[PDB]
Structure 1
């Protein structure tokens, strides 16, 4: 697995990507790693923001599925032509798989200007694949066609360039300290999990835990933010704001409508509280908790042209699709997507940003009753 260490790159806020090759002879592409979706899709036309794109004409092994795909988010989208071809990961396992590939031929607010990636690898399950669950996800094909074990793990670091590791088929013990604690994957569609309790600085939000998961809680490497449902976010913010009364900031800041700034080397770590999410455990009435920091939910925006100060963005936000454990959470931890056992493991990351005031943690066991009631039907 040392071959795969440090095989992810990126820039702050623009996601983590891995090098992949498609077609024969191999075309090299940088591909976004995204556990919040399930299509393998790559740029296939010369959109001006793209360094590189898939040229199906150069590939002996390409096969057209003679079907299209239309994949919208909030305005919005990409649109493509389906096929299969041969696919490798240079700094991954030593195999080549025949995989479905959506050749992207039109898009809107998908590709990012200034970024170094040209596609997206959806690592979640067939249920959320487009246009339907019959389109076999890349990782399914990988596992089905080779002897790679059915799991992958992610260490997302981040510092400007970010870096990390996607270990495919296994676990690298150099990448974490202490023990892995596992929470069940509640359903194989997104990587759905259940939060059973939330503490800010070590204080419960006394909230019907069923809310914390309204209507979803998911682990998503493609999202920068820790994202909370309206009602939970409203209460979430209430306590973070009061935890941090020492100094004040605007209404918009908490709604991600304005960024906040301090001078270089003058930020208050400690005027902000820790977040602890207790996740459902492997055993009835047993949980564990993961604890992050404001360094994780306060992300230092590199270069605003309108300031030379140290400006950070509030990384927590609302949703109607639900909770989203994104880069804010995942950068604190080594995270193991144990598909074979339907569970996701969290351990303290060997690369997380710490000191000797406070530190990221994964602790258990705790006793939590009615953790099923936290799940939404």
Structure 2
């Protein structure tokens, strides 16, 4: 798998992207890697922000599906025209697939000015695909049409350029230390998981574990922040505040809108999430450092409130090697060989723990 190591790039805050080709002859595009959506969508028109775009006129293997797609988001949108064509990943497996492609023809607040990517690879499941679940996502096509095992893994390394690896069809054991620990994919739409306990510096928040997963908890490479449900965020901050009241901060910094410049680190607590294990009454925990939730912009607060559920974004994923084990409906976490630490504390994955009533923690 050494051909796929270090195949991810990006700039701080503008997502991680992989190089892909579409059409024949191949057109090279940089494509955002997103485990929190399910469409393969690329710019197909000369939008000012774009370095390049999909030119369908130039592709002999392109087929029109004669159907449109409109994708609104909380802020802005994209829309396009559905079709299929041949796709490959230069620093991925040595295969070629016919996949669905949304050719983006109109967008609003989608593309980023100054970014170096031109599309998005939705790696989540068909149920959240637009317009509906009959548009087969790229990874489903890849597995169906080739002998690539139904599994991928992400080492997101962070920092200004960022780097990483998407190991398609397997695991590279050199990218983590210790052991992988697995949590069940609760249902195949998002990569939904169940959090069963939260600790701020060893201290249980003592909330009903249901609140951690209201109305869901997901693993999302397209989100920067650790995102927590409203009630949980307030409890969490009230706790991080108290744990680090040796220094003073405006109430807007936790919302979170100011810097701080030099580094102590040690006034801030570690954050531990306990995830449902593979075995009845068994859990494990993942622990992140302030290095993960204090993002340079001098730093900013990268935990924020949400009404979509818990979102385990880059803040979480940058501490760990993450295995999206689709074949066994599970997600693996191990300590990342590249995560940003100091000489006191490191990110951790630890188990097993005894946790009762873990099935009560999921929202219905």
TM-score range, shorter chain: over 0.9
Kindly indicate whether the alpha-carbon contact (under 8 Å) linking 1:249 and 1:260 is maintained by their aligned counterparts in 2.
no
The CA distance in 1 between the partners of 2:357 and 2:184, in whole Å, is: 15
Kindly indicate whether the alpha-carbon contact (under 8 Å) linking 1:193 and 1:219 is maintained by their aligned counterparts in 2.
yes
Where does the alignment leave 5 or more consecutive residues of structure 1 unmatched? 301-310
The CA distance in 1 between the partners of 2:60 and 2:295, in whole Å, is: 44
Kindly indicate whether the alpha-carbon contact (under 8 Å) linking 2:289 and 2:341 is maintained by their aligned counterparts in 1.
no
The CA distance in 2 between the partners of 1:189 and 1:153, in whole Å, is: 18
Superposed displacement of residue 197, structure 1:
0.3
Superposed displacement of residue 76, structure 1:
1.1
| Corresponding residue for residue 257 of structure 2 | 257
| Corresponding residue for residue 148 of structure 1 | 148
The CA distance in 2 between the partners of 1:254 and 1:216, in whole Å, is: 23
Kindly indicate whether the alpha-carbon contact (under 8 Å) linking 2:39 and 2:137 is maintained by their aligned counterparts in 1.
yes
Moved more, 348-357 or 12-21: 348-357
* Post-superposition CA distance 1:78-99 (Å, at most 9, x none): 0000000000000000000000
Moved more, 177-186 or 249-258: 249-258
The CA distance in 1 between the partners of 2:216 and 2:248, in whole Å, is: 32
The CA distance in 1 between the partners of 2:42 and 2:326, in whole Å, is: 25
The CA distance in 2 between the partners of 1:256 and 1:299, in whole Å, is: 11
Root mean square deviation, CA, Å: 0.7
Superposed displacement of residue 261, structure 1:
3.8
Runs of at least 4 residues of structure 1 off by over 3 A?
A: 257-262
Superposed displacement of residue 225, structure 1:
0.2
Moved more, 335-344 or 65-74: 65-74
Superposed displacement of residue 356, structure 1:
2.0
Superposed displacement of residue 256, structure 1:
1.7
Q: Give the structure-1-normalised TM-score.
A: 0.95
| Corresponding residue for residue 369 of structure 1 | 356
The CA distance in 2 between the partners of 1:22 and 1:256, in whole Å, is: 40
Residues paired across the two proteins, number? 363
Superposed displacement of residue 360, structure 1:
0.5
Superposed displacement of residue 353, structure 1:
1.3
The CA distance in 2 between the partners of 1:260 and 1:135, in whole Å, is: 46
Q: Is 1:180–2:177 an aligned residue pair?
A: no
Moved more, 67-76 or 274-283: 67-76
| Alignment match of 1:354 (pick from 332, 335, 341) | 341
| Corresponding residue for residue 294 of structure 2 | 298
SS of 1:253 mapped into structure 2: coil
The CA distance in 2 between the partners of 1:228 and 1:259, in whole Å, is: 21
| Alignment match of 2:331 (pick from 344, 347, 362) | 344
SS of 1:133 mapped into structure 2: coil
